[PDB]
Design a protein around this ligand. Sequence first.
Ligand SMILES: O=C(O)CCC(=O)C(=O)O
Ligand SMILES: [Mn+2]
Length: 201
Amino acid sequence: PLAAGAVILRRFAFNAAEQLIRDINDVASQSPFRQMVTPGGYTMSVAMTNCGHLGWTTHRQGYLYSPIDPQTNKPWPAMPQSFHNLCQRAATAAGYPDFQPDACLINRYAPGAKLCLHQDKDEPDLRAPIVSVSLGLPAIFQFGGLKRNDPLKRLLLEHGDVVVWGGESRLFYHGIQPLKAGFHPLTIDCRYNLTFRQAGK
DNA sequence: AGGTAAACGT
DNA sequence: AACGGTATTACCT
Ligand SMILES: O=C(O)CCC(=O)C(=O)O
Ligand SMILES: [Mn+2]
Protein backbone atom coordinates (compact mmCIF):
# COMPACT_ATOMS: atom_id res chain seq x y z
CA PRO A 1 0.00 0.00 0.00
CA LEU A 2 0.93 3.67 -0.47
CA ALA A 3 1.61 4.35 3.24
CA ALA A 4 0.10 3.73 6.67
CA GLY A 5 -3.52 4.89 6.29
CA ALA A 6 -2.98 5.67 2.57
CA VAL A 7 -4.09 3.93 -0.60
CA ILE A 8 -4.38 4.47 -4.33
CA LEU A 9 -7.59 3.21 -5.93
CA ARG A 10 -6.64 2.99 -9.57
CA ARG A 11 -9.39 4.01 -12.01
CA PHE A 12 -11.88 4.12 -9.16
CA ALA A 13 -13.59 7.20 -10.63
CA PHE A 14 -13.28 6.15 -14.30
CA ASN A 15 -16.98 5.34 -14.63
CA ALA A 16 -18.07 8.49 -12.80
CA ALA A 17 -15.67 10.82 -14.65
CA GLU A 18 -17.92 12.17 -17.42
CA GLN A 19 -20.56 13.28 -14.90
CA LEU A 20 -17.86 14.65 -12.62
CA ILE A 21 -16.56 16.73 -15.50
CA ARG A 22 -20.01 18.11 -16.41
CA ASP A 23 -20.23 19.04 -12.74
CA ILE A 24 -16.84 20.73 -12.67
CA ASN A 25 -18.03 22.90 -15.56
CA ASP A 26 -21.23 23.75 -13.69
CA VAL A 27 -19.31 24.75 -10.56
CA ALA A 28 -16.87 26.89 -12.58
CA SER A 29 -19.77 28.64 -14.28
CA GLN A 30 -20.64 30.11 -10.89
CA SER A 31 -17.21 30.32 -9.25
CA PRO A 32 -14.75 30.53 -12.15
CA PHE A 33 -11.28 28.99 -12.08
CA ARG A 34 -8.68 31.50 -10.98
CA GLN A 35 -4.94 31.32 -10.43
CA MET A 36 -4.48 32.49 -6.89
CA VAL A 37 -1.70 34.76 -5.69
CA THR A 38 0.31 33.59 -2.69
CA PRO A 39 0.89 35.77 0.37
CA GLY A 40 4.42 36.23 -1.05
CA GLY A 41 3.02 37.68 -4.29
CA TYR A 42 3.49 34.83 -6.80
CA THR A 43 0.69 33.64 -9.08
CA MET A 44 0.13 29.90 -8.74
CA SER A 45 0.37 27.82 -11.91
CA VAL A 46 -2.65 25.69 -10.99
CA ALA A 47 -6.06 27.34 -11.58
CA MET A 48 -8.52 26.73 -8.73
CA THR A 49 -12.12 26.95 -7.59
CA ASN A 50 -14.13 25.29 -4.82
CA CYS A 51 -17.48 23.86 -3.96
CA GLY A 52 -19.19 22.83 -0.77
CA HIS A 53 -19.40 24.87 2.40
CA LEU A 54 -15.70 25.78 2.57
CA GLY A 55 -13.17 26.73 -0.14
CA TRP A 56 -9.39 26.94 0.09
CA THR A 57 -8.14 30.45 -0.77
CA THR A 58 -5.05 32.55 -0.34
CA HIS A 59 -5.20 36.03 1.02
CA ARG A 60 -2.57 38.62 1.81
CA GLN A 61 -1.89 37.26 5.26
CA GLY A 62 -1.97 33.55 4.55
CA TYR A 63 -4.27 30.73 3.55
CA LEU A 64 -7.90 30.41 4.57
CA TYR A 65 -10.82 28.00 4.20
CA SER A 66 -13.65 30.44 3.70
CA PRO A 67 -17.41 30.01 3.09
CA ILE A 68 -17.31 32.89 0.57
CA ASP A 69 -15.64 33.11 -2.88
CA PRO A 70 -13.49 36.26 -2.56
CA GLN A 71 -13.74 36.80 -6.29
CA THR A 72 -17.54 36.73 -6.56
CA ASN A 73 -18.37 37.58 -2.94
CA LYS A 74 -20.95 34.81 -3.00
CA PRO A 75 -20.86 31.39 -1.32
CA TRP A 76 -19.03 28.69 -3.26
CA PRO A 77 -21.38 26.55 -5.32
CA ALA A 78 -22.96 23.62 -3.45
CA MET A 79 -21.01 20.38 -3.63
CA PRO A 80 -22.48 18.40 -6.55
CA GLN A 81 -24.17 15.16 -5.53
CA SER A 82 -21.94 13.33 -8.03
CA PHE A 83 -18.86 14.64 -6.18
CA HIS A 84 -20.27 13.80 -2.78
CA ASN A 85 -21.29 10.29 -3.84
CA LEU A 86 -17.93 9.43 -5.44
CA CYS A 87 -16.05 10.77 -2.44
CA GLN A 88 -18.13 8.66 -0.06
CA ARG A 89 -17.60 5.45 -2.06
CA ALA A 90 -13.87 6.11 -2.41
CA ALA A 91 -13.41 6.89 1.27
CA THR A 92 -15.32 3.74 2.22
CA ALA A 93 -13.22 1.52 -0.08
CA ALA A 94 -10.10 3.12 1.37
CA GLY A 95 -11.18 2.22 4.89
CA TYR A 96 -12.64 5.58 5.90
CA PRO A 97 -16.39 4.83 5.92
CA ASP A 98 -17.28 7.74 8.24
CA PHE A 99 -15.75 10.63 6.20
CA GLN A 100 -18.02 13.69 5.76
CA PRO A 101 -16.34 16.32 3.56
CA ASP A 102 -17.48 19.94 3.74
CA ALA A 103 -15.04 21.26 1.16
CA CYS A 104 -13.97 20.36 -2.36
CA LEU A 105 -10.97 22.16 -3.94
CA ILE A 106 -11.02 21.84 -7.73
CA ASN A 107 -7.55 22.13 -9.38
CA ARG A 108 -6.99 22.61 -13.12
CA TYR A 109 -3.54 21.87 -14.56
CA ALA A 110 -2.48 23.22 -17.90
CA PRO A 111 0.87 22.06 -19.32
CA GLY A 112 3.66 23.12 -17.00
CA ALA A 113 1.43 23.55 -13.94
CA LYS A 114 2.70 22.10 -10.69
CA LEU A 115 2.08 22.06 -6.98
CA CYS A 116 5.27 22.17 -4.94
CA LEU A 117 5.60 19.79 -1.99
CA HIS A 118 3.22 20.80 0.79
CA GLN A 119 1.17 19.39 3.64
CA ASP A 120 -2.56 19.59 4.12
CA LYS A 121 -2.60 20.49 7.75
CA ASP A 122 -4.62 23.63 8.28
CA GLU A 123 -7.90 21.74 8.74
CA PRO A 124 -8.92 21.95 12.46
CA ASP A 125 -9.89 18.26 12.58
CA LEU A 126 -6.94 16.19 11.26
CA ARG A 127 -8.77 12.94 12.12
CA ALA A 128 -10.41 13.06 8.66
CA PRO A 129 -8.76 11.79 5.47
CA ILE A 130 -8.04 13.59 2.24
CA VAL A 131 -9.71 12.11 -0.85
CA SER A 132 -8.03 13.21 -4.06
CA VAL A 133 -9.54 12.39 -7.50
CA SER A 134 -7.54 12.66 -10.78
CA LEU A 135 -9.17 13.39 -14.13
CA GLY A 136 -7.79 13.94 -17.62
CA LEU A 137 -4.06 14.11 -18.42
CA PRO A 138 -1.61 12.04 -16.35
CA ALA A 139 0.54 13.60 -13.65
CA ILE A 140 3.44 12.56 -11.43
CA PHE A 141 2.31 12.69 -7.82
CA GLN A 142 4.95 12.98 -5.12
CA PHE A 143 4.21 11.45 -1.74
CA GLY A 144 6.71 11.64 1.10
CA GLY A 145 6.54 11.70 4.89
CA LEU A 146 6.22 13.99 7.90
CA LYS A 147 9.37 15.88 7.00
CA ARG A 148 9.99 17.74 3.79
CA ASN A 149 13.21 15.83 3.11
CA ASP A 150 11.76 12.37 3.79
CA PRO A 151 12.25 10.21 0.66
CA LEU A 152 9.56 10.69 -1.97
CA LYS A 153 7.52 8.06 -3.73
CA ARG A 154 6.66 9.12 -7.25
CA LEU A 155 3.44 7.74 -8.67
CA LEU A 156 1.85 8.37 -12.01
CA LEU A 157 -1.81 9.32 -11.45
CA GLU A 158 -4.03 8.62 -14.43
CA HIS A 159 -7.62 9.51 -15.32
CA GLY A 160 -10.01 8.19 -12.65
CA ASP A 161 -7.35 7.31 -10.09
CA VAL A 162 -8.27 8.21 -6.51
CA VAL A 163 -5.77 8.68 -3.75
CA VAL A 164 -6.75 8.69 -0.08
CA TRP A 165 -4.57 9.51 2.88
CA GLY A 166 -5.33 9.83 6.56
CA GLY A 167 -4.42 8.57 10.01
CA GLU A 168 -0.66 8.13 10.22
CA SER A 169 -0.10 9.59 6.77
CA ARG A 170 -2.58 12.47 7.05
CA LEU A 171 0.15 15.14 7.39
CA PHE A 172 2.58 13.74 4.79
CA TYR A 173 4.15 16.09 2.24
CA HIS A 174 2.93 15.59 -1.31
CA GLY A 175 2.87 17.49 -4.59
CA ILE A 176 2.49 17.39 -8.34
CA GLN A 177 5.40 17.67 -10.82
CA PRO A 178 4.97 20.05 -13.81
CA LEU A 179 2.29 18.64 -16.11
CA LYS A 180 3.34 17.19 -19.45
CA ALA A 181 1.41 18.39 -22.51
CA GLY A 182 -0.87 15.83 -24.07
CA PHE A 183 -4.35 14.91 -25.18
CA HIS A 184 -7.26 13.40 -23.29
CA PRO A 185 -10.67 12.66 -24.86
CA LEU A 186 -12.58 14.02 -21.83
CA THR A 187 -10.54 17.07 -20.77
CA ILE A 188 -8.80 17.76 -24.12
CA ASP A 189 -5.65 19.47 -22.89
CA CYS A 190 -5.66 19.54 -19.09
CA ARG A 191 -5.74 17.63 -15.83
CA TYR A 192 -8.31 18.21 -13.10
CA ASN A 193 -8.08 17.12 -9.50
CA LEU A 194 -10.85 17.11 -6.90
CA THR A 195 -9.63 17.35 -3.35
CA PHE A 196 -12.25 16.59 -0.63
CA ARG A 197 -11.64 17.59 2.95
CA GLN A 198 -13.40 18.11 6.19
CA ALA A 199 -12.19 21.67 6.63
CA GLY A 200 -14.45 22.83 9.45
CA LYS A 201 -15.98 21.35 12.56
C1' DA B 1 5.06 29.89 23.23
C1' DG B 2 3.37 28.41 18.82
C1' DG B 3 1.73 29.03 14.39
C1' DT B 4 3.00 29.56 9.93
C1' DA B 5 4.06 31.95 5.20
C1' DA B 6 7.22 28.58 0.80
C1' DA B 7 6.60 29.74 -3.63
C1' DC B 8 15.95 29.57 -6.78
C1' DG B 9 20.83 27.22 -6.96
C1' DT B 10 23.35 23.17 -7.58
C1' DA C 1 16.71 17.55 -13.20
C1' DA C 2 16.24 15.51 -8.34
C1' DC C 3 17.08 17.49 -4.23
C1' DG C 4 17.06 20.78 -0.89
C1' DG C 5 17.64 25.89 1.01
C1' DT C 6 14.72 29.29 2.54
C1' DA C 7 11.24 30.82 7.54
C1' DT C 8 18.89 30.34 9.96
C1' DT C 9 12.74 35.24 10.09
C1' DA C 10 9.03 38.52 10.91
C1' DC C 11 4.75 38.79 12.16
C1' DC C 12 0.56 37.40 14.53
C1' DT C 13 -2.46 35.69 18.34
O1 LIG D 1 -3.62 17.55 -7.85
C1 LIG D 1 -3.30 16.69 -7.00
O2 LIG D 1 -3.25 15.47 -7.27
C2 LIG D 1 -2.98 17.14 -5.59
C3 LIG D 1 -3.72 18.43 -5.25
C4 LIG D 1 -3.41 18.83 -3.83
O3 LIG D 1 -2.45 18.37 -3.24
C5 LIG D 1 -4.28 19.81 -3.17
O4 LIG D 1 -5.24 20.26 -3.85
O5 LIG D 1 -4.03 20.19 -1.99
MN1 LIG E 1 -2.42 19.03 -0.96
